[model samples]
Target: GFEFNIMVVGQSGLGKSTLINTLFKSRIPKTIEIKSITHDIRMKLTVIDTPGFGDHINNENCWQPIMKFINDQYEKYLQEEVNINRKKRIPDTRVHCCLYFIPATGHSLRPLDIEFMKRLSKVVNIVPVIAKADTLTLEERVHFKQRITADLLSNGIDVYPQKEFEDRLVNEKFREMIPFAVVGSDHEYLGRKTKWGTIEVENTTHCEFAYLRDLLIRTHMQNIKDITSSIHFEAYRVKRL
Candidate 1:
């Protein structure tokens, strides 16, 4: 079975835990928790949750711990590779994807957001999401997404599924969904009933939760693993050697 590891990074109240639980159909606690599951009894999935990431008052170099954790996993894999009597299959713990949650502020990216992504994008595949998107009005959501895209481009912050790494036709679709606006719900309901109507969490018209799930689990699972092994890990390997 193939092994895949995922790391989720965000602030405390951005619904990181809830969104992950909804996506994987499992509950994850606030503290660091590691859970493994098998899909179709073929793929072994490991998820690592990071809570209280940017919740500090000072919030200086807050990403350092996360940076160290990622590098530590890479170092562990390198140790096995160099062993003279290495086993046929070395246990893979390197993180393949990082789900980065941005608060649903109806403005451009914050300095902390920009700096954090810039540093981590060098070593991991970052999939940015606007959390609690249901709070924003339809027009606000559209403008927020557009402003984010411009800020990311102007700041040279690279995100996952980059245009150059995907097929032309496929890339266009993914590009349109960058920084997916998402809402999370634990219970299965048609949608949250409002005065106007219901807002289904999985409905594409309501939010991009379904698209995020499909991209991360269904369509791009293997692609994410491949990129981590070939590009991210290879760079780490070279630097270590």
Candidate 2:
């Protein structure tokens, strides 16, 4: 079976790592402070957490380098036809799917967030997560979701860009795209810290996490099939080199 890598990217302290670790039930790469060094390696089913932007007093250079790194990887794959594992004949930006985490506590959407989404729009598929839902009250959550949808709509996102491949690649036009769902942490895992004692901040709701877990499994499985099936199809039509 082929592997799929799902990345959770956003400004730091936006609950990217928190939601990922909570949903995947695995340790994620992260640090609690505002500005910290990070490793730039890829992992199977890993969630790539970018450093916090704007608010941080330092490390302005972190954001672009990370973007360049991601773009570079895609460039390599597109040019050389190498998979994340350096295997042969993999599709470019086969980075499969991504979850763009947006913290509920923040303003509708920051300029940096908008820029990142625009860049991603030109590359791989992306799903926007209204993360940390518990941070918003019932009315606030509704308002937040509406505002996000409107913003994404204005920015021309179609197909909802969910983790579900069917939902992502379906026949929805740009105006019809803009899919969204409120996501929160599993209550049982709230206040749960990592091995390093970092506080696990998340949208506190048992059901949200479960739903996200199932969604990830379904979409990721489908993505794997989509990639490998394409490879097999090409292999069938080609002469052995």
Clashes of 1: 0
Say which candidate scores most in lDDT: 1
| Lowest lDDT block of 10, candidate 2 | 34-43
- On a 0 to 1 TM-score scale, where does candidate 1 land against the true structure? 0.89
Give the alpha carbon lDDT tens digit for every residue of 1-241 in model 1: 7787878788878887777666766244566533333343266777777756667778887788889889988888888888999999999889889888989999899988888888989999988889889989989999999998998899888788865573767756776887898887777654556798777888988999888888886688888888888888889999975
Q: Relative to the true structure, how large is the alpha-carbon lDDT of every model?
A: 0.80, 0.51
Q: How does model 1 fare in lDDT?
A: 0.80
In model 1, pairs of residues that clash are none
RMSD of each: 2.6, 8.2
Scanning candidate 1 in windows of ten residues, the lowest lDDT window is 32-41
